[PDB]
Write an enzyme that holds these catalytic residues in place. Structure first.
Site, PDB file in Angstrom:
ATOM      1  N   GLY A   1      40.092 -20.296 -17.107  1.00  5.75           N
ATOM      2  CA  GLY A   1      39.577 -18.940 -17.093  1.00  5.75           C
ATOM      3  C   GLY A   1      40.116 -17.968 -18.123  1.00  5.75           C
ATOM      4  O   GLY A   1      40.245 -16.774 -17.835  1.00  5.75           O
TER       5      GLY A   1
ATOM      6  N   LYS B   1      46.440 -25.701 -24.642  1.00  7.09           N
ATOM      7  CA  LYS B   1      45.733 -24.862 -25.597  1.00  7.09           C
ATOM      8  C   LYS B   1      45.367 -25.691 -26.816  1.00  7.09           C
ATOM      9  O   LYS B   1      46.232 -26.344 -27.408  1.00  7.09           O
ATOM     10  CB  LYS B   1      46.588 -23.673 -26.029  1.00  7.09           C
ATOM     11  CG  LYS B   1      46.866 -22.669 -24.939  1.00  7.09           C
ATOM     12  CD  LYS B   1      47.598 -21.474 -25.510  1.00  7.09           C
ATOM     13  CE  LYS B   1      47.622 -20.339 -24.520  1.00  7.09           C
ATOM     14  NZ  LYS B   1      48.285 -19.134 -25.081  1.00  7.09           N
TER      15      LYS B   1
ATOM     16  N   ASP C   1      51.599  -5.364 -24.133  1.00  8.77           N
ATOM     17  CA  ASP C   1      50.312  -5.642 -23.494  1.00  8.77           C
ATOM     18  C   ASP C   1      50.527  -6.115 -22.054  1.00  8.77           C
ATOM     19  O   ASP C   1      50.012  -7.145 -21.626  1.00  8.77           O
ATOM     20  CB  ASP C   1      49.497  -6.647 -24.315  1.00  8.77           C
ATOM     21  CG  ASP C   1      48.008  -6.475 -24.119  1.00  8.77           C
ATOM     22  OD1 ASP C   1      47.592  -5.410 -23.610  1.00  8.77           O
ATOM     23  OD2 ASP C   1      47.255  -7.392 -24.489  1.00  8.77           O
TER      24      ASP C   1
ATOM     25  N   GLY D   1      39.257 -16.933 -22.069  1.00 12.13           N
ATOM     26  CA  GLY D   1      38.733 -16.960 -23.421  1.00 12.13           C
ATOM     27  C   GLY D   1      39.754 -16.482 -24.427  1.00 12.13           C
ATOM     28  O   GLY D   1      39.750 -16.927 -25.579  1.00 12.13           O
ATOM     29  N   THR D   2      40.645 -15.592 -24.002  1.00 11.75           N
ATOM     30  CA  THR D   2      41.744 -15.088 -24.815  1.00 11.75           C
ATOM     31  C   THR D   2      42.688 -16.201 -25.258  1.00 11.75           C
ATOM     32  O   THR D   2      43.848 -15.949 -25.587  1.00 11.75           O
ATOM     33  CB  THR D   2      42.551 -14.031 -24.040  1.00 11.75           C
ATOM     34  OG1 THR D   2      42.973 -14.580 -22.784  1.00 11.75           O
ATOM     35  CG2 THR D   2      41.703 -12.795 -23.783  1.00 11.75           C
TER      36      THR D   2
ATOM     37  N   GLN E   1      41.207 -21.481 -26.735  1.00 13.27           N
ATOM     38  CA  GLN E   1      40.649 -22.393 -25.745  1.00 13.27           C
ATOM     39  C   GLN E   1      41.752 -23.119 -24.985  1.00 13.27           C
ATOM     40  O   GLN E   1      42.686 -23.643 -25.589  1.00 13.27           O
ATOM     41  CB  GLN E   1      39.721 -23.401 -26.415  1.00 13.27           C
ATOM     42  CG  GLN E   1      38.898 -24.216 -25.438  1.00 13.27           C
ATOM     43  CD  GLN E   1      37.671 -24.819 -26.085  1.00 13.27           C
ATOM     44  OE1 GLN E   1      37.720 -25.286 -27.223  1.00 13.27           O
ATOM     45  NE2 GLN E   1      36.556 -24.801 -25.367  1.00 13.27           N
TER      46      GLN E   1
END
Ligand SMILES: *CCC(=O)Nc1cc(C(=O)NCc2cn(-c3ccccc3C)nn2)cc(-c2n[nH]c3ccccc23)c1
Length: 283
Positions: A26, A46, A140, A28-29, A30
């Protein structure tokens, strides 16, 4: 060194064809869910394509750099190893349950304080570790970057924009209007704590990015309601994080001496069970 998977202290010589692809996940930030055939371990992988977007690839590699040298922090997701093929780089990370954001969606309501207390201890110690040990600022902090698993662990996710900008919704006032820095992450932690404690995002009914910034500066900090039974210590912690003058905002070393932190360091809270039962509710 790459071509090695180390899980729980045991290193196995491995290649990517020793891994079975069990499907996308889940972010998108493969990232894939994969199964180590030699041991049965299920891991997150990843895949960085060589021909990929170099703006994103630069971000995968900065994230990997701090992940790799952060192996002695139990509040940061670990890397089991890497595989460097001619066309791809594969980054094997530990597999966890979900991000705190999805927990809020599945919960369809507030997260209990005792779970947020263990979470607050974990993220603060993770960010303090990044500052003192590596001089790294996360920049972040948000519920999508807080991870939880079946075994009660809470860890900082992946920091690809870490510096030695972030989402506008969790940005501190002095990053919106810098007068001319490590305390900007404390603010986003507070906004994330209020969000998960109430089930609502603080700055509500905002249609554009700029409008969110406007209410961060124009309006009072969004504090915890007093009719939900929150402990006094929890409210004191949130108000301290959500202080608008960044100079009067506490550092991490002062934050760690807070009563809220000190209580949940020593209080045995079963996060594992609460996590499995909340995850049981389907959709
Ligand atoms: C929302 C942000 C985020 O990072 N989410 C995220 C989700 C998942 C995830 O949903 N994994 C699914 C899963 C399923 N199992 C499973 C299923 C059936 C039987 C047994 C088991 C164990 N386990 N997980 C995972 C991740 C994730 N996991 N590891 C990492 C590392 C770094 C970033 C993200 C991440 C994240």
């Amino acid at each position: 060194q790459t071509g090695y998977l180390t899980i729980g202290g045991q290193r196995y010589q491995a290649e990517i064809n020793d891994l079975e692809n069990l499907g996308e996940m889940g972010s998108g930030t493969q990232v894939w869910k994969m199964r180590f055939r030699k041991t049965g371990h299920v891991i997150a992988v990843k895949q960085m394509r060589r021909s990929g977007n170099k703006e994103e690839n630069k971000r995968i590699l900065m994230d990997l750099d701090v992940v790799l040298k952060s192996h002695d922090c139990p509040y940061i997701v670990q890397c089991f190893g890497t595989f460097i093929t001619n066309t791809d780089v594969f980054i094997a990370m530990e597999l966890m349950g979900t991000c705190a954001e999805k927990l809020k969606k599945r919960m369809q309501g507030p997260i209990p304080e005792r779970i947020l207390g263990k979470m607050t201890v974990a993220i603060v110690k993770a960010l303090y570790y990044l500052k003192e040990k590596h001089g790294v600022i996360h920049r972040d902090v948000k519920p999508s970057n807080i991870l939880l698993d079946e075994r009660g662990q809470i860890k900082l996710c992946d920091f690809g924009i870490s510096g030695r900008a972030g989402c506008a919704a969790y940005m501190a006032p002095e990053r919106i209007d810098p007068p001319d820095d490590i305390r900007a992450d404390v603010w986003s932690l507070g906004i994330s704590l209020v969000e998960l404690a109430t089930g609502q995002f603080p700055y509500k009914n905002c249609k554009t990015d700029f409008e969110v910034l406007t209410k961060v500066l124009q309006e009072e900090p969004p504090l915890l309601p007093g009719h939900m039974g929150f402990s006094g210590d929890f409210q004191s912690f949130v108000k301290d994080c959500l202080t608008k003058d960044h100079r009067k905002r506490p550092k991490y070393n002062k934050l760690l001496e807070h009563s809220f932190i000190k209580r949940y360091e020593t209080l045995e809270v079963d996060v594992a069970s609460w996590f499995k039962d909340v995850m049981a509710k389907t959709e």
